[PDB]
């Protein structure tokens, strides 16, 4: 009854800067969850040649690509933030502003949280195949551009997303 | 907003889904990997579904995107039945996809190994990929069916 | 998969570089694997349980008792580990999870471990204690394959024991019971006495059917060799070199086979 | 209102619940029959019939959501909320029966097409044994639509 | 009006139980009769019984399901608040026990498949075994219709 | 009021947990007569008495859940918290003991589908502990029905 | 008011830990019983004391909820949370003790069985350890007891 | 007021807690004893001890619960939340104490139960080790005691 | 005027933690001691000390809950609300340095007894770690001291 | 108001985080060091790769929560909820971020350790690599800068 | 009113973390050390070092906690919420911090004194990095300590 009415109210601001950070937060760990993975893959193999160690500097270079793209999330976010007076800080406008704003973050760094590690087990996969056949390169790197599209893509949902908010 | 954010999840369900098939494109990869030691036409033939996969993450991507722009929430004002309606339609249809992602690595998985050996049923595997595709485009229509059932 | 990812990554490469690497002399490559496996010390857990099958026989010579130490410096030290008569088997029994079986199917020692039949025994007991070694990795399909190829061996051992050892005198159903989930029960090669008619039962075995076809060398074969082609075909499923799962012993079990053909070519 | 919200939270709860448990059952099927296209092309023919038939079970589970989004009218007169509740359950009760079915189907159909490699005609009776179950997923997957239709009079 | 909505969710319940108890049986049953057709082909079509036991609790669990779903409408019963919880619960403890019936019915579906591999005999009697095993779901969907008949019974 | 709401789900919960045990003791006597009669036949025949004697329990689940919903009546009292509470209590007790001497049965009867394998002497004493489940479950069961009846308020 | 509720909940833990606990008593006790008799038939009579003792234990906790219900008559005294409050936590205390006394003798008992079929002096040592456990329950009894004193002790 | 709550519940948890620990370490006693007169009689004889102190543990929890109980006296005590308080808080420690008192007692049973087949000079030794744990649990009860006795100061 | 039983139950809590750490040291540094038996009889010297240590942890408990319960005196000086508080706080902090310490000590002795059977030379070595171990008991019952110390001035 | 309380606790959260992960990397790292020094002791004493990672997260979760810590000041602004709950967040974002940063290079930099004692071009490699995974912490550290500077606002 | 006491449960929190943290690391070291001195009764004595950097972190948090008691004083303002919050804040971070310190430092002590055994060599660079696993916890502590000093929050 009572709780029903008060789990209502909330404050819009703390969910917009939730948005702004916790996705830039959540990119860079699945970054470093990958690069992780990279490594103990350049590390398996680096016993033959570093092929295999350039093809984990490309699949580095994307979670670099992926750092980047968060970055530019959270610049936008600073700037895409409404006037959002301190006083006026309880309009239902600013709460909608502040839910999609929060949407944006959500599906902004959870779909590159999950690009980053499924790039990272796929180069994990394609240093061991490079390690194991010679020739097999342009194929372990055209994974590695599937993975750098989809953080790519994730990074134009962010943008297409910064214009969102409502808030007054 | 309560309408706003059932609405906001009701798209971010069906993206999380393009994210969870994500995961899919991740074992098709690693099995592509395996599959193109043996030669790099294996190699190639099972780099294509990869890049399939990713192309279908972007699709998912370029939905959101429209979503995005149909986001504006002053044409269409939404009731606690509108916003329900919306996000358990965006739950259901990701979790067919995220169902159909799955579906599809392990497929592309099993394919990888068939082109790592003779071609064989290579036919057979990629209706297989294709069957898992399909559940996956059904999902994503059925979500612009539910992006559509909205208003008074 | 992704637990491969997350953590062991580079052990599993390194293990599955080794595998690949490899496609008296025998002894000599038997003991570079030993090396490489001491050099990189899940398919950790299956490397150790091959490790102690190949330290199960080496006690089975050691608990036995003419130069033994020599005979055992001779084995590759993954066969002859280092860690390690009654006092032989029990002192083995420590650190080998194989050598408490054999030691207790072996109740006269060196005596109940005669080379002519009951040391065959002995070694079929301390397979069984590695293969619930093997089975202690909680399951898996590299699990599975252990588990074929231990059924293989009991198969083998049953038709070795209706072809020869009945002259050896060895219970029937001590027999079955010396041949060793699947290689727990083998009542259907069991069931004929005659070795021509238990041939054609331990051949009808999944794991010696489609793959012994003919058998003129094999399943006619006493000790353990019905199952040889069946070894060369488990052998060829690790050629499948899946990854993301246990394939060590895999790796072992293919250095093993690669020593034994260079062996078996000798000169030219 | 409260019940076009909770007959859509049952109607999609239907469509989610039974899209997971035929997802399930599919690959299950679908290893099995891997292996036995795999270990023979013949059979692969035969085998590859069930892994297609969950996955049209699946995409029948999921187009049962689209008709009973018209189960629940929010443009009509608004009943009691109970109405809506019920419209609910009964989304529900579809979801789980086709989930359950449809993952038993699949459970089934991987040892069977598995073990049709030694026999071919196994994988016939795989397939009749997978239908046997799919076709309850399927029917009850719609006959949770059709009652969450049907239920909405409220006197 | 809390009556209704709480007499559908137990319906719902009463489904999805019945369909989860027939989904183990059914996926036990097959995978006993995957390894059996192996041996005997010919024992395969025996071992097809405890299926169709399932098949048939499923069955009875969804047809208790629309005979619940059935009287929603306020006009039509006396539905007072305890009552609709009554079939609610009729509904719950119905489909639970078929639910743990096919559980218990695909346990010793794959017994009996293992039996078929022995002697037939042991089959046989696997069969009386399943038999009275199945007679649970039955009694569980006449013990759910007699507590919503009471249920119905309302003022 | 809503009591009687409460009391129908404890009904409810008695009859789905006693059938809950009821039945996978019965699944774990079956498999265990399923291994004695590839076994021996002779055992075969004793082996099905614990699968009986544990659906026993269902069915005393069965008809004490079929009472308690016979016991709420509008017409026989008005709603009121303290006989809801009561029997809803009396039923969730009855089912739990139904369950756990339903989940002895079943290990109980594996060990004596093993002891029969074993001895015939060993069958009778398994057949002695099936009768002491039984009683326990008797008593569990005689319990609830009190503290049904106990339904005064 | 509510005192009934809380005095009718503890009752029923009672019953239902006291009866969790002698399963558990009891399903020891007949795996030792069937190992004895597997290893020697003839001392199997024997070895079915610590089973009588754990199903002693369960019956006098499940007596003693049974009087402490029997206390609850809400015509007697008016209503008092004091006396429900008592009530509940006597039920509770004694069906927690019974579980423990019943889950701990019966793998003592188990121990003590398998002993005995090893020597014969290991049986009295096993009767005197569960000579020592039914000090646990003897102490819930007693509990159960001063909280049921106490309950009359309201005002 | 909310003093038979928490009295109530705490008298309760005292005795529960303490007669859990109090069996954990009397059935890994017992399993040790049985093991030792399997070895040896005399050692069976000699590994009484455990099961002593598993007894005492058990009548200190009893007693504090007893003293708890004792000190409810709502005639003559006003409804105060501290009076309840300090009884809740008595009962607490006496259950916390009683059962870490339990799983150490069994843990030194079983170490003293291999000792005696080791040496009967080991035995001997860990007898103070298992006297030193059961002053632990005495100095838990004493500030029991404590505890208990400052329920004086409401009234 | 509800801190009361706040600070009742951290005094409750204190003792119990404390008593639950020193029992869960007693009992490893036992089971090791055992372990250590027949091989090594003459160390039952060098197996005492980890029970020592454990009593005197589970002495230094006791003290505190004596120290906290003597602070509660409702008589004189109304406990108001920050007496309560900070008796739970107290009594916390105690029965947590207890329990780490127990745990500790536990694993130290369990080592030092394995060490015993061979090599005694290192006694000196494995008291050491013993007593550099129950420094952290000591070490929290200053802590619970000072903590306790500060209550009364929260009166005014 | 409560805008403080938000502030300090998501500042204590940020410092709190960072070490864990700063932690947990330099565990992992240490023990493949010493793993990887006793074959050779010569290539240990290069093994200092994994301290001055180490150090280098501490230095950043250090620095962070001082620059939280100084935006702290109530006589300069009176603050908001908004103000303050932005804040918080901001920070405990960045040590998040600095945390899987160092948890992940130190699990890299476990195997570089056996890496570089295999040989000296692995150990570049794996020096590399953990340059990366710094520049990733770093960029992780101006992220929470700048969070930390629209908190000013 | 009460921050200032969740300020001081705070504050106690932190000494418990920190305590928590520093015993694990001197369990692991305490392992070692005896390892080292089965080993060699030499590399033993020089062992110790680790244990002494935990007792020291320990310290260091016991400094930290009677630092933030002292800061509470009833004296210096009256009844404030921020006092009680950036104390626990403090608190919380400075324990958090000393106990992830103090178990990365011990799993690195106990490789080390492993390591130090068969080769002294390496024993300088375990030390080195040991001290800047200290040194870690030592800036977590300065950090909180700055949050401390920070205690003029109005006025």
């Given at each position: 009854?009572?709780?029903?009415?008060?789990?209502?109210?909330?404050?819009?601001?703390?969910?917009?800067?939730?948005?702004?950070?916790?996705?830039?937060?959540?990119?860079?760990?699945?970054?470093?969850?990958?690069?992780?993975?990279?490594?103990?893959?350049?590390?398996?193999?680096?016993?033959?040649?570093?092929?295999?160690?350039?093809?984990?500097?490309?699949?580095?270079?994307?979670?670099?690509?992926?750092?980047?793209?968060?970055?530019?999330?959270?610049?936008?976010?600073?700037?895409?933030?409404?006037?959002?007076?301190?006083?006026?800080?309880?309009?239902?406008?600013?709460?909608?502003?502040?839910?999609?704003?929060?949407?944006?973050?959500?599906?902004?760094?959870?779909?590159?949280?999950?690009?980053?590690?499924?790039?990272?087990?796929?180069?994990?996969?394609?240093?061991?195949?490079?390690?194991?056949?010679?020739?097999?390169?342009?194929?372990?790197?055209?994974?590695?551009?599937?993975?750098?599209?989809?953080?790519?893509?994730?990074?134009?949902?962010?943008?297409?997303?910064?214009?969102?908010?409502?808030?007054? | 907003?309560?309408?706003?954010?059932?609405?906001?999840?009701?798209?971010?369900?069906?993206?999380?889904?393009?994210?969870?098939?994500?995961?899919?494109?991740?074992?098709?990869?690693?099995?592509?990997?395996?599959?193109?030691?043996?030669?790099?036409?294996?190699?190639?033939?099972?780099?294509?579904?990869?890049?399939?996969?990713?192309?279908?993450?972007?699709?998912?991507?370029?939905?959101?995107?429209?979503?995005?722009?149909?986001?504006?929430?002053?044409?269409?004002?939404?009731?606690?039945?509108?916003?329900?309606?919306?996000?358990?339609?965006?739950?259901?249809?990701?979790?067919?996809?995220?169902?159909?992602?799955?579906?599809?690595?392990?497929?592309?998985?099993?394919?990888?190994?068939?082109?790592?050996?003779?071609?064989?049923?290579?036919?057979?595997?990629?209706?297989?990929?294709?069957?898992?595709?399909?559940?996956?485009?059904?999902?994503?229509?059925?979500?612009?069916?539910?992006?559509?059932?909205?208003?008074? | 998969?992704?637990?491969?990812?997350?953590?062991?990554?580079?052990?599993?490469?390194?293990?599955?570089?080794?595998?690949?690497?490899?496609?008296?002399?025998?002894?000599?490559?038997?003991?570079?694997?030993?090396?490489?496996?001491?050099?990189?010390?899940?398919?950790?857990?299956?490397?150790?349980?091959?490790?102690?099958?190949?330290?199960?026989?080496?006690?089975?010579?050691?608990?036995?008792?003419?130069?033994?130490?020599?005979?055992?410096?001779?084995?590759?030290?993954?066969?002859?580990?280092?860690?390690?008569?009654?006092?032989?088997?029990?002192?083995?029994?420590?650190?080998?999870?194989?050598?408490?079986?054999?030691?207790?199917?072996?109740?006269?020692?060196?005596?109940?471990?005669?080379?002519?039949?009951?040391?065959?025994?002995?070694?079929?007991?301390?397979?069984?204690?590695?293969?619930?070694?093997?089975?202690?990795?909680?399951?898996?399909?590299?699990?599975?394959?252990?588990?074929?190829?231990?059924?293989?061996?009991?198969?083998?051992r049953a038709v070795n024991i209706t072809i020869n050892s009945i002259?050896?005198?060895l219970?029937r159903?001590?027999r079955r019971?010396?041949y060793?989930?699947?290689?727990?029960?083998?009542?259907?090669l069991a069931v004929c006495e005659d070795i021509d008619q238990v041939r054609?039962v331990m051949?009808?075995?999944?794991?010696?059917?489609?793959?012994?076809?003919?058998?003129?060398?094999?399943?006619?074969?006493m000790?353990?060799?019905?199952?040889?082609?069946?070894?060369?075909?488990?052998?060829?499923?690790?050629?499948?070199?899946?990854?993301?799962?246990?394939?060590?012993?895999?790796?072992?079990?293919?250095?093993?086979?690669?020593?034994?053909?260079?062996?078996?070519?000798?000169?030219?």
């Amino acid at each position: 009854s009572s709780w029903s009415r008060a789990l209502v109210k909330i404050s819009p601001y703390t969910f917009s800067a939730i948005g702004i950070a916790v996705a830039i937060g959540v990119s860079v760990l699945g970054a470093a969850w990958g690069i992780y993975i990279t490594g103990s893959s350049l590390i398996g193999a680096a016993i033959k040649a570093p092929r295999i160690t350039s093809k984990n500097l490309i699949s580095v270079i994307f979670c670099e690509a992926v750092a980047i793209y968060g970055v530019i999330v959270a610049i936008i976010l600073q700037t895409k933030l409404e006037s959002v007076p301190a006083s006026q800080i309880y309009a239902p406008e600013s709460l909608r502003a502040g839910y999609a704003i929060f949407a944006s973050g959500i599906i902004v760094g959870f779909a590159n949280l999950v690009c980053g590690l499924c790039v990272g087990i796929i180069g994990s996969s394609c240093a061991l195949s490079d390690a194991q056949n010679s020739s097999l390169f342009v194929k372990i790197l055209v994974i590695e551009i599937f993975g750098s599209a989809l953080g790519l893509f994730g990074v134009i949902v962010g943008i297409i997303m910064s214009a969102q908010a409502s808030w007054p | 907003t309560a309408p706003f954010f059932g609405f906001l999840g009701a798209a971010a369900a069906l993206v999380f889904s393009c994210m969870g098939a994500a995961y899919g494109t991740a074992k098709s990869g690693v099995g592509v990997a395996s599959m193109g030691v043996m030669r790099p036409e294996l190699v190639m033939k099972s780099i294509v579904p990869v890049v399939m996969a990713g192309v279908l993450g972007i699709y998912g991507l370029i939905i959101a995107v429209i979503i995005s722009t149909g986001i504006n929430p002053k044409a269409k004002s939404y009731y606690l039945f509108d916003g329900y309606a919306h996000l358990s339609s965006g739950l259901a249809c990701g979790l067919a996809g995220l169902s159909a992602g799955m579906a599809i690595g392990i497929v592309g998985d099993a394919g990888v190994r068939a082109n790592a050996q003779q071609p064989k049923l290579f036919v057979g595997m990629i209706l297989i990929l294709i069957f898992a595709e399909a559940l996956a485009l059904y999902g994503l229509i059925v979500g612009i069916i539910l992006s559509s059932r909205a208003g008074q | 998969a992704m637990t491969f990812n997350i953590h062991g990554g580079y052990l599993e490469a390194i293990v599955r570089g080794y595998r690949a690497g490899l496609l008296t002399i025998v002894e000599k490559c038997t003991l570079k694997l030993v090396d490489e496996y001491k050099h990189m010390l899940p398919l950790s857990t299956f490397l150790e349980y091959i490790t102690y099958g190949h330290m199960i026989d080496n006690v089975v010579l050691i608990v036995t008792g003419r130069d033994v130490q020599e005979l055992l410096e001779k084995c590759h030290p993954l066969g002859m580990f280092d860690s390690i008569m009654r006092e032989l088997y029990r002192l083995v029994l420590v650190d080998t999870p194989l050598a408490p079986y054999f030691s207790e199917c072996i109740t006269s020692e060196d005596l109940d471990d005669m080379n002519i039949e009951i040391m065959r025994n002995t070694l079929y007991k301390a397979y069984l204690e590695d293969f619930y070694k093997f089975c202690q990795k909680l399951g898996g399909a590299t699990a599975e394959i252990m588990s074929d190829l231990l059924a293989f061996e009991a198969d083998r051992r049953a038709v070795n024991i209706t072809i020869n050892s009945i002259g050896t005198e060895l219970t029937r159903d001590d027999r079955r019971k010396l041949y060793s989930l699947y290689p727990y029960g083998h009542e259907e090669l069991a069931v004929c006495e005659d070795i021509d008619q238990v041939r054609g039962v331990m051949e009808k075995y999944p794991p010696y059917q489609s793959i012994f076809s003919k058998l003129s060398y094999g399943e006619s074969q006493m000790l353990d060799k019905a199952f040889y082609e069946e070894e060369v075909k488990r052998l060829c499923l690790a050629f499948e070199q899946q990854f993301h799962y246990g394939v060590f012993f895999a790796y072992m079990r293919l250095r093993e086979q690669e020593i034994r053909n260079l062996m078996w070519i000798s000169e030219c």
